[PDB]
Amino acid sequence: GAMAEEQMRLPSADVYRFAEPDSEENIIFEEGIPIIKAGTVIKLIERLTYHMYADPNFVRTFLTTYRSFCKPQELLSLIIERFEIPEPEPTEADRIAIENGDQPLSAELKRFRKEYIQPVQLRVLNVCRHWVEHHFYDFERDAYLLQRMEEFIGTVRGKAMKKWVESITKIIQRKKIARDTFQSSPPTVEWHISRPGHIETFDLLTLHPIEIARQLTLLESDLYRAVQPSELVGSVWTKEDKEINSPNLLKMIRHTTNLTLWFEKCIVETENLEERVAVVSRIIEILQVFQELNNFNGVLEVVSAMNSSPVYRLDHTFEQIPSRQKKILEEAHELSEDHYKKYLAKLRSINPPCVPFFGIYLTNILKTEEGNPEVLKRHGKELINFSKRRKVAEITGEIQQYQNQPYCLRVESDIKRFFENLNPMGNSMEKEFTDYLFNKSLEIEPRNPKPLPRFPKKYSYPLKSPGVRPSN
Numbered sequence: 001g002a003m004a005e006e007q008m009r010l011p012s013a014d015v016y017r018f019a020e021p022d023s024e025e026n027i028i029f030e031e032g033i034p035i036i037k038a039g040t041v042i043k044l045i046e047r048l049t050y051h052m053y054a055d056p057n058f059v060r061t062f063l064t065t066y067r068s069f070c071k072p073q074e075l076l077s078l079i080i081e082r083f084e085i086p087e088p089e090p091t092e093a094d095r096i097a098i099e100n101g102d103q104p105l106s107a108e109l110k111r112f113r114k115e116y117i118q119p120v121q122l123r124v125l126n127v128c129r130h131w132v133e134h135h136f137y138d139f140e141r142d143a144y145l146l147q148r149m150e151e152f153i154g155t156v157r158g159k160a161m162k163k164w165v166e167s168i169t170k171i172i173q174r175k176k177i178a179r180d181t182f183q184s185s186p187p188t189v190e191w192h193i194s195r196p197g198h199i200e201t202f203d204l205l206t207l208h209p210i211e212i213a214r215q216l217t218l219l220e221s222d223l224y225r226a227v228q229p230s231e232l233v234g235s236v237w238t239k240e241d242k243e244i245n246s247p248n249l250l251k252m253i254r255h256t257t258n259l260t261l262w263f264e265k266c267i268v269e270t271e272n273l274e275e276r277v278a279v280v281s282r283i284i285e286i287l288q289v290f291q292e293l294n295n296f297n298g299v300l301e302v303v304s305a306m307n308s309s310p311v312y313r314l315d316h317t318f319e320q321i322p323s324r325q326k327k328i329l330e331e332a333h334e335l336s337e338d339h340y341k342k343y344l345a346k347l348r349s350i351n352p353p354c355v356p357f358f359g360i361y362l363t364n365i366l367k368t369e370e371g372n373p374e375v376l377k378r379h380g381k382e383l384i385n386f387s388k389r390r391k392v393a394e395i396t397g398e399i400q401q402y403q404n405q406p407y408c409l410r411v412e413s414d415i416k417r418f419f420e421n422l423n424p425m426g427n428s429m430e431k432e433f434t435d436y437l438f439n440k441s442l443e444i445e446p447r448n449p450k451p452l453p454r455f456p457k458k459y460s461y462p463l464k465s466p467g468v469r470p471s472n
C-alpha cells in the first residue's frame, strides 16, 4: 500500500542507517513540529537533518548539549554518513537502456533526488554552518576535527550547495583570524590612600571602596560574559577533563572562591577588634556599591564571606557595626531566602547593566543532572534522554540573555591585575586554609566563657572610610 510505498522510496536498512521506520523502540516525542523527548543517537541525527521541515530549535539545543552523549569526532562521522545517501537502483526497463546505450526515464530517481537527497544534504550543511559559527571551540581544541570538516566541505560538488560551502568557508575564515567605546562619559576613577602606580600599597583599606566595587564588577562582568553553554552541560566542569571543557566557567568559580576567601582572610587576620570592625564595615560598603551597580554576583560573594563559619561567629565585631550597615547585610542575605525568590524578582525588575548571581545557575543545573536519568528504557532498549539536555540548555539560555550588558566604567589596569592575581590560599589546599581561617576566628574571639584578649594594631594609616558617594 501507500504506507509501504512511502517507506520503500527511502533507502533500505542494509545500505543506509538513517531511514528505518519510527517506533517506540527508537524515538519518543513529548505530545506543529513535534518535540523530541528521547531516542537513539541515530534517530537524533536523522531528526537533526530532517527532510520535510527545518527545526532550528532542535539544532541549537543539539549542538549546545550533544557532548553529554556523543563525542565531537563521532558527531562529524554521523553527519557525513547522513550526507552520503545511496541512490536506488534503476528499473528493469531503465537498466537495459544502459547496456544498449540510451538515457533512461528515471522518474523515481529524480523525485528521490528532489524531495529527499537534496533536502537532507541541505540540512546537514546548515548543521555544519551552525557548528562552526556558534561552537568553534571544538575545532580549535581538536585540530584533526577541523581538517575533516574542511576536507568534507571541500568535496561537495553541487549547484544548489555552492552558497552553503561559500558561507561555511567564510565563517572558518573569520574564526581562524579571530584567534588573534562608551555611550556616555564614564565617571572618574576614584582613589583613597594608595596613589595611582603605587601597586605595592594596594589593599582592602588603601584602595577606594567605590573603585574596588567598580573594578570587581568589570572583572566579573567579563568573566560572566565569557562562559559558553556547553561548559555547563553534563556536569563537565566536575569531570576529569574540566580544564579544556570548562575554562571560562572554572575561571568564574575560582575568582568567586578567591574573592570570598580573601574577604574572610582580611577580616580574621586583622586581630585588633577596632581595626577588624573597620575592615568589615569597608566590605559592607563594597557590597553597597555592588548593589548600586546591580552586580548581584558581587553582593552574594560578600554575603557568602559574611555568612562563613569564621566570620559569622564574630559577635564582638558585629556589635560595633552600625545598625544601618547591619540592615544592608540583612537585606542582602534576604535575596537568597525562599529559593532566591527576592533575588529573581529583583533581577527581572531592573534595567541593564547587571552581573547575575552565577552560583544559582550551577545549583539548578546540578539538580537537573542528578534529578533526571541519563537514558530512558523502552522494550529493553536504552534511549538517550534529550529532554534532560533541553532543560539544562534552557537554564544556559537564561545565562545568555544577560551576557551583552557592558558597564559605563573605565578600567584601571593595576587595580584589575591586583584582583585577578588574588591568592588568599597561597600554597595551602582549600580545606587547610578554611580550617586555618576558623582557627584564626577562635583566636581573635574565643568561645564563652573564655576572656576576650586585646591585640596590637597592624595598620599605620587612617582607617576612616572615604565613603561611597562618588566625586562631583
Ligand SMILES: COc1cc2ncnc(N[C@H](C)c3cccc4ccccc34)c2cc1OC
Pocket: 303, 306, 307, 311, 312, 318, 326, 327, 329, 330, 332, 333, 334
Ligand atoms: C538563618 O541564619 C541566618 C540568618 C541571617 N539573616 C540575615 N542575615 C544573615 N546574614 C548577613 C549577611 C550577616 C552576616 C554576618 C553578620 C550579620 C550581622 C547583622 C546582620 C546580618 C549579618 C543571616 C545569616 C544566617 O546564617 C548564616
